[PDB]
Design a protein around this nucleic acid. Structure first.
Lengths: 151, 198, 47
DNA sequence: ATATATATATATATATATATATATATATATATATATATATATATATATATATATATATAT
DNA sequence: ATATATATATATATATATATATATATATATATATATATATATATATATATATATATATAT
């Protein structure tokens, strides 16, 4: 019932918003508001890459470890297979692993990532963008989704 | 771009010589300094009585006298706490006003730096992605001045919410699993906690 | 966190001795090198 | 007859010397930092001269 | 009685001297970057030699 009421209030909110918009009463980010709003949204993404940094470091370290351990003659074939599976599960359940897994799961629903890149283009088109961000920042944000996928 | 190429280097030569947050990180004693100060301020950021801080700092100083190379005073750690609060005022780490000391912004940046640095688990986390997601959606929808486009936005969003409302009428609710919930919670903490920043 | 209340100084003592970035910020020549390196990488997006 | 074996050149490899750039290490000179001697600011007792009022004389 | 007016007293501020806390100029030691040196590796050229493949003479 809580979720039902939440949905009811949200639909009423959007009902009023639609009634206003159809009446011509739309509202735009006032030209200064948009600038800081964009600067905010940029700052928000500015972490994801700097943490995929650590995702890389972790899995690289895991690989290096598995190699270094495989030298131990004591390890049956069954020992090494288990070590592999457990290393991967552990690296997955750790937070950085959770981030990576979430990203991957998004890739199953590619539509969302593509829509995000589309909306990023539309945003970076708006003139205010030039003010909010020097050339370089706009470049990188324009190509965020890729610079995660590649990574 | 060339617009800032030559200029920027000087912009950095300056910061190194004067900006506090950087200067501290150059000093040899920077580790103990920053650790202790984080300790002090963490308990609360409303502002600390000066001598209450002297006391707590002296308490923390004795804790780390075992760090031999920095010769933390023993005969009177309280006096040393005073002689060191003097330093953190003179060095602009802590402006004090209203009789209660405070952390200059330089300290805020310096501290949020080291925390991100070490290889404990990261600052951001999974939810961040869904966060940029929804905010981008909203930011576009608002920024769009075309009214018919806002109409399309509202129609799609309300149709989505209508799907979920119909499902809720049939009782098909879902919740985060501990994985998701814990992740979102840490994220939200790390998010709102930046409002305090500036 | 209470464990970290002492262990924390250990981490920071570690960084200032080993972690590259921190060590970089310390040496006298640092700002020139850092600025130049950003200049280079700034254009780059594939290396 | 078909096919085999030798000589030739060619294409490649190997070897040597000269030189330069690199790396690893010593010694040096410079900078940060902490340590020191000095002069000065705060707090205190005693004592005196002072203002405020009691205590007090005096008045209507 | 109320109100003016009295000498003494209450309380104070200022002054002298004392001690201790703090700020600073200076000394000194340690930390660090940087120049000098020896040995090493890279690559060049120069030359000899080995290699494959073919031209070629040859057997049966």
């Amino acid at each position: 019932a809580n979720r039902v009421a939440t949905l009811r209030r949200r639909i009423s909110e959007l009902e009023r918003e639609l009634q206003e918009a159809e009446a011509g009463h739309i509202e735009v980010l006032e030209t200064h508001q948009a600038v800081e709003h964009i600067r905010d949204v940029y700052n928000l993404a500015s972490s994801l890459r700097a943490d995929f940094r650590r995702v890389e470091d972790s899995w690289r370290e895991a690989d290096r470890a598995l190699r270094q351990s495989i030298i131990g003659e004591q390890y049956h074939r069954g020992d090494i297979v288990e070590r592999l599976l457990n290393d991967q599960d552990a690296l997955l359940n750790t937070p950085e692993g959770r981030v990576f897994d979430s990203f991957q799961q998004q890739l199953r629903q590619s539509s969302e990532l593509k829509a995000m890149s589309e909306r990023l283009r539309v945003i970076l088109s708006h003139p205010s963008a030039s003010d909010a961000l020097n050339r370089l920042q706009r470049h990188d944000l324009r190509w965020l989704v890729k610079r995660l996928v590649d990574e | 771009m060339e617009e800032n190429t030559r200029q920027r280097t000087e912009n950095y030569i300056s910061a190194k010589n004067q900006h506090p947050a950087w200067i501290l990180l150059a000093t040899r004693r920077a580790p103990l300094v920053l650790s202790a100060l984080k300790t002090l301020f963490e308990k609360s950021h409303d502002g600390i009585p000066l001598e209450e801080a002297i006391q707590s700092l002296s308490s923390i100083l004795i804790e780390h006298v075992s760090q031999e190379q920095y010769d933390i005073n023993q005969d009177n750690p309280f006096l040393q706490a005073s002689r060191e609060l003097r330093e953190w005022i003179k060095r602009r780490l802590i402006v004090e006003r209203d009789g209660r000391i405070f952390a200059t912004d330089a300290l805020e940046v310096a501290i949020t730096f080291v925390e991100s640095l070490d290889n404990r688990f990261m600052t951001s986390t999974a939810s961040r992605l869904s966060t940029v997601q929804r905010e981008i959606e909203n930011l576009e929808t608002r920024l769009n001045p075309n009214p018919a486009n806002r109409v399309a936005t509202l129609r799609r969003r309300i149709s989505e919410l209508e799907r979920e409302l119909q499902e809720a009428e049939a009782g098909h609710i879902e919740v985060l699993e501990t994985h998701q919930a814990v992740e979102h919670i840490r994220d939200v903490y790390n998010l709102a906690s930046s409002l305090r920043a500036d």
